Structures are given as structure tokens and as C-alpha cells.
Design a protein around this nucleic acid. Structure first.
Ligand SMILES: [Mg+2]
Ligand SMILES: [Mg+2]
Ligand SMILES: [Mg+2]
Ligand SMILES: [Mg+2]
Ligand SMILES: [Mg+2]
Ligand SMILES: [Mg+2]
Ligand SMILES: [Mg+2]
Ligand SMILES: [Mg+2]
Ligand SMILES: [Mg+2]
Ligand SMILES: [Mg+2]
Ligand SMILES: [Mg+2]
Ligand SMILES: [Mg+2]
Ligand SMILES: [Mg+2]
Ligand SMILES: [Mg+2]
Ligand SMILES: [Mg+2]
Ligand SMILES: [Mg+2]
Ligand SMILES: [Mg+2]
Ligand SMILES: [Mg+2]
Ligand SMILES: [Mg+2]
Ligand SMILES: [Mg+2]
Ligand SMILES: [Mg+2]
Ligand SMILES: [Mg+2]
Ligand SMILES: [Mg+2]
Ligand SMILES: [Mg+2]
Ligand SMILES: [Mg+2]
Ligand SMILES: [Mg+2]
Ligand SMILES: [Mg+2]
Ligand SMILES: [Mg+2]
Ligand SMILES: [Mg+2]
Ligand SMILES: [Mg+2]
Ligand SMILES: [Mg+2]
Ligand SMILES: [Mg+2]
Ligand SMILES: [Zn+2]
Lengths: 124, 138, 99, 151, 208
RNA sequence: UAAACUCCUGAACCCGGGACGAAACCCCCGAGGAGGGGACUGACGGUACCGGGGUAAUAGCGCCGGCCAACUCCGUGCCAGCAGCCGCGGUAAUACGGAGGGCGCGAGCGUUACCCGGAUUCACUGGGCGUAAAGGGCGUGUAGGCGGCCUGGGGCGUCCCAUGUGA
RNA sequence: GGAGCAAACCGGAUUAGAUACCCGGGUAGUCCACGCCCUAAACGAUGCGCGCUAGGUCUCUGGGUCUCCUGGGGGCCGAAGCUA
């Protein structure tokens, strides 16, 4: 592009979509469970994953994945979505924060607790 | 009609030097003289004279080159490695003083017109002025 | 100092008012190449002296009307319609753009 | 008896009935650490040999580096067709700020204050060659007026 | 503050003899004289060529660990180094030295820097009359890094004093061993220094 | 050397003393002025700080397949789960979970969100278009952009100097 | 307007099937006048203009006493240089 061109038209300011519509700028959003259930993984994997649809404060409604071995999520559990995609499964753009609300952490986990809401045990 | 006389010559020079031609012409101008008058001053050209071609004014620029070379490819070094116009006709460049380039850390020269002449990076600098950055060579 | 401008008069159809067009020039903030833009000013002319095609000095002035805050200072050269030629041509290619 | 360190060591492979057979490639830089340097590329059906093969073309190939208190006489952009790379001189107390590859080439070259970045393809190999032939063009204030003079 | 945990242990990862210990590190045992290899189940097996990372990395961890100092603090100094004129690699180090708890070591009023910190922090030291206890305190040139009144005749003070007789120390310094006090001549030249560390490699890692 | 053990230091804690922040308006000389002198007033606070006594006296989080610093043992067997991407787990897993060990950093360590960077991936600086994405199917022309050689007038851009301004 | 050809269509054959390939037949269409459509591998997949930078070879076309110089097109091979 000649400069005269640049002066006329100009360089199109790039722009990017938000891989997660949680809220205007919210870091997480409080949701509530509707369905809760195992769903088979994608192309190269297979292993009945844990997810739940989540009626939102934001009037929305979406699936969020549940991390860790086993969960206490029932068809009404208030919940907290942290939001992070999952190559494994379609549509799941959000992760659920174990450790807050009816998101009970995992039991018996020693490693990388924080990431799974579990308090640090004791030895005595 | 040629859009820019100037970079046209510099091209002449460039293409020429690349096959090592002793000297090559270029239509005459008060300005190109002045340009060359610096190509000489600073030792990029051996020099130039208002040679004629068919009643038409030109300039013989007599090209400086390196010594022959040893090993694969007897390619002479190059007196003019790199020449390129800056302030183009499509986009005028007009540097103030504290804005003049420092071509290749001194080794490089930068010509440029000025209200007090056709100076250079240091000549205009030391003289203490600014003007249209004609081009840089090294 | 009351800013002042030379632009060509470009319409006289007003009562004691005149349209003056003034190209400024300047360098593009990122692309340098001096570019050219222009604006019309609504000058006052209580003597209705200046006619079309006049090139005029215009001075920032006390507000005469909604759009007049300049007055005609002095002529600079009569016959120069060739410029109004342009302003008219421009203003006519428009009519062939709509739908 | 120069200092010696290999850049990258890769395992390409060719095809043929029955199966595929492989080879390995070793880029190596080599230098004194005061102006002598040389990278060289060698390939052999096995690693050690292949590295050794470099060690040969390494020392074999070479180039004068016109240093300057550990920096350089002036910046250079040089495009090896596909890859580009820009070296710029810097005050002492800066560092060898450059990539994996162009780093070694400069460090085992006695350099210590250099501003450099790649552009275009960042291909090790291709950037390698670019970095050499870059160096092989630096003119010293001397080298310069030794040409501009011609007396 | 300083990783209170096992320290005759770092000498082992860096692989260089480091004087975090006082007497003992000079003895046969910086941890290292008996065990010259890195800690852990492995480390006694054949290591591997540190990527250009590990190198610039481990060199940093060296020169840092040597002062037993806050990463945030270090990091800061490194940057302060670029803030001012001169050769950053040097002033960084020169600046490291200005640290009071480092002077009560270069001036030897203690066998270790960690030891040195205690005393400094405990008000045991002073400067020009005031009981500075801020390990951080940047020593400018020319100031009585003395010892305090309540402190002079102290048990572990003397054992380092009676051991501090003779033995020249620091061209950028001076020690009135009798009056129990030193001076900051000037800012430690690079040559005046001698650490197991390449400053040029630490700058590298602080560009990532 | 980590612990144990010996020694030395002495956060916390207790005792004592304890402000700077406040010299003015207000009072006499002179003149209610200039000039000097004369007194009151501290919420914070019996805190700051200063001296005496004085107890060894909180560690945590992330990671350790590659990028990326930091390895092995067991369990699990495409299940349980991991994930930023490349991918990992279908009996021998440094990629899952537990362990020992190691790396990083420490009153913090991680996660998520958004902004700039990397991105020379909108490119003025600094990009392209024969086949990778990209030459309008071809003309003709409006506006616009760009424009050869020499002399001279103005000096609009441009340049330089001073000056106001840029709190 | 309508000879030949020929989507669609009909029939024969081939095939598991054959709404195709092959064969027999066949209509718009192909042609003209006027009007519209405005697409394409509308390809050199290369915007136009201008100045620069070896030569070798045959070819179309023009000028000049003319085993060859000079100008304009069309090709192949290749200086330097560019190029993934
Ligand atoms: Mg600095
Ligand atoms: Mg300097
Ligand atoms: Mg101990
Ligand atoms: Mg202990
Ligand atoms: Mg005891
Ligand atoms: Mg005390
Ligand atoms: Mg009292
Ligand atoms: Mg009174
Ligand atoms: Mg009290
Ligand atoms: Mg009291
Ligand atoms: Mg307080
Ligand atoms: Mg006390
Ligand atoms: Mg590693
Ligand atoms: Mg299981
Ligand atoms: Mg296993
Ligand atoms: Mg494996
Ligand atoms: Mg494991
Ligand atoms: Mg991992
Ligand atoms: Mg950017
Ligand atoms: Mg950008
Ligand atoms: Mg561009
Ligand atoms: Mg591109
Ligand atoms: Mg085309
Ligand atoms: Mg003039
Ligand atoms: Mg004049
Ligand atoms: Mg300011
Ligand atoms: Mg039809
Ligand atoms: Mg074609
Ligand atoms: Mg060809
Ligand atoms: Mg070639
Ligand atoms: Mg070739
Ligand atoms: Mg090109
Ligand atoms: Zn030790």
C-alpha cells in the first residue's frame, strides 16, 4: 500500500472475541446447577467426563466442567464458575471452582490443593 | 517523465557499481551535481564532469571500487555498499536538527538539503541546522 | 492576534455574507506526507463589494450570526474562477453517489 | 585448539521400501573468544560422527570479527533469503541479548554487549548462516577509509 | 527472609564452595568437601548440559544465594542498576556490597553474613553514632561502621575480633581493629571484587 | 549439619522516661504599624522514639514430559483423571494419584479476568500479492495523489535563533 | 432462421445397478436482427507509466550501400540480481 493509500484507507485495527462470556469483565460468576452428568470426550480420548449446565445470575445458562476425582454437585448446587476451556469436550468453556459454595473441594488430595479447594490436612 | 530525478541517479550508480562499470551517465542538474559534489567530497565517487550525449547534458560518475579479491569469487569489495533515497516524492522527509540520523555509527553519511546548503549529517549538524533528508549512503 | 486566513470566495448568494474556502496543509501524524484539507468560512461583507472568485484575507471577528465569526479583510486577486471551478466540480460528483 | 559448542542436533530421515532410514545433523559454532569464529554444518548416519563432522567444517570455516571493547563497529540487518537478523552495538554492561542460535555465534566470538533480534523465518540453520555472513560484513573505521581512500 | 532451612546444601547444587558457613566451610566440610555433588536421590548420576536457560539461571541463583537475600530485593537492585549510568554488571555488585549486613562481613565482625545480619539487626552495630539495625542500610562512602557501647565487650564479638587481627581485608575498606570500627573508603571496583560468579550471565537472565 | 546437643544473640513480653507537629491571634514599649519582649493551646498519645530487664520465638504455595528450573518408587490400566498448546493414561506412566527427593518463591504462592508484549500477526518505524491469502475481466476518464531542464520574485511548507506558553 | 451438431428426452448395449461412458433417434440451443444478462482457470493465475542493469540464438515487421548497424513485436537459453 502506497502511503497515499495509507492516508486514505489506513491499517485495520485488529480486534478479538472473548473466548468466554462470563460477564462484562467479571473474573468469575455465581451460577446454579440444573443438570449434572457424565459426557464422553472427543477425538483421541474417552472417559465419561463430569460437567453441569448452570443457570446464571447473568440470565445466561451454560455447561461448566468439574475437576478432580468425584464431586458433590447435585441438581441444585449453587456454584462458582472460573471459566477455562477444555480441549477435550465441545461447548464447555468454563470450569467450576471446587472449594466455594456447594463446590466442596476434593477429599484425600495432598498435591496442588489450592487448585482444588482442599484445606491442608494435619499429621499430628 | 520520471517521478523522481534523484533516486533515479542513485539507482544508476547502484546498478552500475553492481557490475562494476567504470562510469555511467545521468542527465544533468544543478542538484544532482551538488549531490555528487558530496559523493566526491566524502569519497564514494572518484568524480564527475558535465559530459555530453547527443546535445543533451549528462554527468559521468566515475565509480570507486574495492581491490580485487582472494579465494572463491574475485568480487572486489564495494566503495558504495548501500545507497537508498529517504525523503521520497510520495512522502517528504523533513528532519529538524536534533533529529538527523547517525548512519551506521559514523561510517555512514546522510546528505540533505538545507536553507544554508546541501550539507551532511555532520556538516549540517556541526553547522547546526535541519532540512530535507535527501538520502543516506555507506 | 486575531487569526487570519486567505481562502477563495465561493458563494455570494447571501445578503451581505460570503462563502470562503481555505485549504490548509500539514503532515500526517503517522504518515508524514503533507496532506491537504479545507474548510468553508462564512465571512461578512456589509458593502457587498467582494464577488465570486475573489481570494481574500479573512479575520476572526465579533460574531455576526450563527455561522459568521470572520470578516473580509482585503482582496488578493480578482479573476480566479479556475479554483471555484474545482470546488463546484467536487460538489457535483456527489449528486452521482446516492441511490 | 579453539573453544567449541554445537548449536542444534537433529534427526531427519529418508524413505525406502521396508522402512525409513535416518541421519543426524549437527550445527556447531566455534571460536577463540577474541575475534576468531566459525560455524559449520555436518551430517552423518550417527550423532557423534555427525558432531565430529561439524567440528571439522567448524574449524575449517572461519571469520575475523572486528570487535570493539567486546561490541561491534556498527549495526547490520542481513537477510539470508528467508531469515533476517539485526545486530546493533551496545554499551558494555548490556549483554549477549539475542536468540538461542545467534547467541553462541556471538559469545564464542568474544562479544559481550550486543543488541540483536531475528525476523522472517527463525530457522536455526538458516538464521545460523545469516548470522555468520552478517558478521563477515562489518567494516571497521579502518577497513572503511582503506577503501574510501584508494590513494 | 533467608531460607532458614538446610544451607550447606546450596553449595552442592551450584557445585561451588560457598561461605554461608563460617569456620566449618573453611574446615573440611562446606558440606562440600565430603560431598562435592548436588543434593537429592540423584545428582550423583551423570548430569546433563544445562540449556542456555539453566546456565543463566543457576549463575543468578549463585550470586543471589551468596548474599542470602530477598528475591524481590535483589530483582530491585538489579533494576536500580540499570537506572543509573555506568556498567550495570559492576554497580549491581558494587551496590550489593553497600548493604550494611554485607559490610559487617567484609569487615568481618562476624564469620557469616547470616551471622552478620543477626548482629546488625539486633542493634549490635552502629554508624556515626546511631544504632542502625536495617540490614538494607546502604553504606555510602566514609562512615564509622563502628560497634555499639553496650556491645563492644561481647562474647561472639571478640572471638571474631581476636581472630580479626592482621589479615588485610578490602582495598575499598579500612579496619580500626582496636577501636572496633571500619570505614567505607569508596565503592568497590570490579577488580577489587572476586566472586565465583559471572556478572554478565546474571544480566542475561534478567532479560528472560 | 539437617535434627539432636553446647554455646552466643534476643521479636514478643514487663519497668522507666516521653515529644517534634505550636507559634501565631491574643498581653505591655512604641502608635493597635515596623521592631522586641511576655503567656495559653496536641485529638494522634503515655503511641513515636529513648534507657533497663527478657523468653529461640509463624511457613507456606506453585511446579518438576517438551517449551521450563527441577527424577524415581508404588497404585491405576483409554478407567480414575490431566491440559496453555504438542499431547498423556488401552501393565511395566519422570504427563494420572500417593511418596521420597528436587526446582522456584517465600508471608506469600497459585488460579481466573482484562490491558500492552511477544505479534515484523495492520508492517510510519517494519510486511506482502506467478503458483502459499491477495492484481480490479479490459478500457476511457472525474476528483485526488505524483511530476522533467535553467533564470528570477515572494517565502506557504521546511529550517534556525531568540521570546511567551507548556500550572 | 434451422443443414450439421446437440443438454433435456427416447431407445440399444455395458453393468450388480448405469438416470453415465459406447451406439441409434432427438428438442431448445447453436445462426441473424434488435434488446437484456455482465459471469469465467475473463490466466502470463504477473495493475499501468517511466529510467536504470551481459550477451547468445530465430522470428515477424519497418528504415539504411547493406557478409551488417538501427527501431518496433513475438519466442527459447541464459550476466549479475531476486527467489521458499
Ligand atoms: Mg546502567
Ligand atoms: Mg555514557
Ligand atoms: Mg545450624
Ligand atoms: Mg540449629
Ligand atoms: Mg540448652
Ligand atoms: Mg533492647
Ligand atoms: Mg510521669
Ligand atoms: Mg491592648
Ligand atoms: Mg512509660
Ligand atoms: Mg508515668
Ligand atoms: Mg502507628
Ligand atoms: Mg529493650
Ligand atoms: Mg530439564
Ligand atoms: Mg481406577
Ligand atoms: Mg507405573
Ligand atoms: Mg514412555
Ligand atoms: Mg510422575
Ligand atoms: Mg506436567
Ligand atoms: Mg504489535
Ligand atoms: Mg504491531
Ligand atoms: Mg510499508
Ligand atoms: Mg506477509
Ligand atoms: Mg489482469
Ligand atoms: Mg524562487
Ligand atoms: Mg527576499
Ligand atoms: Mg512536564
Ligand atoms: Mg431454454
Ligand atoms: Mg492462457
Ligand atoms: Mg528463461
Ligand atoms: Mg546467479
Ligand atoms: Mg546464475
Ligand atoms: Mg523483490
Ligand atoms: Zn558450607
Amino acid at each position: 500500500p502506497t502511503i497515499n493509500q495509507l492516508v486514505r484507507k489506513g491499517r485495520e485495527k485488529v480486534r478479538k472475541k472473548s473466548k468466554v462470556p462470563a460477564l462484562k469483565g467479571a473474573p468469575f460468576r455465581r451460577g446454579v446447577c440444573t443438570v449434572v452428568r457424565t459426557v464422553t470426550p472427543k477425538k483421541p480420548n474417552s472417559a465419561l467426563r463430569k460437567v453441569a449446565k448452570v443457570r446464571l445470575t447473568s440470565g445466561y445458562e451454560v455447561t461448566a466442567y468439574i475437576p478432580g476425582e468425584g464431586h458433590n454437585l447435585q441438581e441444585h448446587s449453587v456454584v462458582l464458575i472460573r471459566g477455562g476451556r477444555v480441549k477435550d469436550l465441545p461447548g464447555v468453556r468454563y470450569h467450576i471452582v471446587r472449594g466455594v459454595y456447594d463446590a466442596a473441594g476434593v477429599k484425600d488430595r495432598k498435591k496442588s490443593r489450592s487448585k482444588y479447594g482442599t484445606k491442608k490436612p494435619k499429621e499430628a | 517523465m520520471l517521478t523522481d530525478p534523484i533516486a533515479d541517479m542513485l539507482t544508476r550508480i547502484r546498478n552500475a557499481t553492481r557490475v562494476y562499470k567504470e562510469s555511467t551517465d545521468v542527465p544533468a542538474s544543478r542538484f544532482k551535481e551538488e549531490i555528487l559534489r558530496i559523493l566526491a567530497r566524502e569519497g564514494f565517487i572518484k568524480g564527475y564532469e558535465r559530459v555530453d550525449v547527443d546535445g543533451k547534458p549528462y554527468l559521468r560518475v566515475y565509480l570507486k571500487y574495492g581491490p580485487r579479491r582472494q579465494g572463491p569469487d574475485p568480487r572486489p569489495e564495494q566503495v558504495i555498499h548501500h545507497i537508498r533515497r529517504i525523503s521520497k516524492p510520495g512522502r517528504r522527509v523533513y528532519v529538524g536538527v536534533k533529529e538527523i540520523p547517525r548512519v551506521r555509527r559514523g561510517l555512514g553519511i546522510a546528505i540533505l538539503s538545507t536553507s544554508k546548503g546541501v550539507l551532511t549529517d555532520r556538516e549540517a549538524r556541526k553547522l547546526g541546522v535541519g532540512g530535507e533528508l535527501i538520502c543516506e549512503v555507506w | 492576534p486575531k487569526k487570519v486566513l486567505t481562502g477563495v470566495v465561493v458563494s455570494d448568494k447571501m445578503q451581505k455574507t460570503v462563502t470562503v474556502l481555505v485549504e490548509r496543509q500539514f503532515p500526517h501524524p503517522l504518515y508524514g506526507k503533507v496532506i491537504k484539507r479545507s474548510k468553508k468560512y462564512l465571512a461578512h461583507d456589509p458593502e457587498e463589494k467582494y464577488k465570486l472568485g475573489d481570494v481574500v484575507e479573512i479575520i476572526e471577528s465579533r460574531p455576526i450570526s450563527k455561522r459568521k465569526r470572520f470578516r473580509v479583510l482585503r482582496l488578493v486577486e480578482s479573476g480566479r474562477m479556475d479554483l471555484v471551478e474545482k470546488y463546484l466540480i467536487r460538489r457535483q460528483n456527489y449528486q452521482s453517489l446516492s441511490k | 585448539d579453539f573453544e567449541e559448542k554445537m548449536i542444534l542436533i537433529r534427526r531427519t530421515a529418508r524413505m525406502q521400501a521396508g522402512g525409513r532410514r535416518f541421519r543426524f545433523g549437527a550445527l556447531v559454532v566455534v571460536g577463540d573468544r577474541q575475534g576468531r569464529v566459525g560455524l559449520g554444518f555436518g551430517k552423518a548416519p550417527e550423532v557423534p560422527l555427525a558432531v565430529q563432522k561439524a567440528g571439522y567444517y567448524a574449524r575449517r570455516n572461519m571469520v575475523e570479527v572486528p570487535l570493539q571493547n567486546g561490541t561491534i563497529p556498527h549495526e547490520i540487518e542481513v537477510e539470508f533469503g528467508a531469515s533476517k537478523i539485526v545486530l546493533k552495538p551496545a554499551a558494555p554492561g548490556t549483554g549477549v541479548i539475542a536468540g538461542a542460535v545467534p547467541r553462541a555465534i556471538l559469545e564464542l566470538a568474544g562479544v559481550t554487549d550486543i543488541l540483536t533480534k531475528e525476523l522472517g523465518s527463525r530457522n536455526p540453520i538458516n538464521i545460523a548462516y545469516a548470522t555468520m555472513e552478517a558478521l563477515r560484513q562489518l567494516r571497521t573505521k579502518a577497513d572503511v577509509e582503506r577503501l574510501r581512500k584508494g590513494e | 527472609g533467608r531460607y532458614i532451612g538446610p544451607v550447606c546444601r546450596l553449595c552442592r547444587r551450584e557445585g561451588v564452595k560457598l561461605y554461608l558457613k563460617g569456620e566449618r566451610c573453611y574446615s573440611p566440610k562446606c558440606a562440600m568437601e565430603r560431598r562435592p555433588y548436588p543434593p537429592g536421590q540423584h545428582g550423583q548420576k551423570r548430569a546433563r548440559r544445562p540449556s542456555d536457560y539453566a546456565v543463566r539461571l543457576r549463575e543468578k541463583q549463585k550470586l543471589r544465594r551468596i548474599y542470602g537475600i530477598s528475591e524481590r530485593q535483589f530483582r530491585n537492585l538489579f533494576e536500580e542498576a540499570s537506572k543509573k549510568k555506568g556498567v550495570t554488571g559492576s554497580v549491581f555488585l558494587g551496590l550489593l556490597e553497600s548493604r550494611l549486613d554485607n559490610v559487617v562481613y567484609r569487615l568481618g565482625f562476624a564469620v557469616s553474613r547470616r551471622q552478620a545480619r543477626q548482629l546488625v539487626r539486633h542493634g549490635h552495630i552502629t554508624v556515626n553514632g546511631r544504632r542502625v539495625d536495617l540490614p538494607s542500610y546502604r553504606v555510602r562512602p566514609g562512615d564509622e561502621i563502628a560497634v555499639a557501647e553496650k556491645s563492644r565487650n561481647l562474647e561472639l564479638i571478640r572471638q571474631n575480633l581476636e581472630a580479626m587481627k592482621g589479615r588485610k581485608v578490602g582495598p575499598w575498606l579500612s579496619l580500626d581493629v582496636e577501636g572496633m570500627k571500619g570505614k567505607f573508603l569508596r565503592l568497590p571496583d570490579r577488580e577489587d571484587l572476586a566472586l565465583p560468579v559471572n556478572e554478565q550471565l546474571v544480566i542475561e537472565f534478567y532479560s528472560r
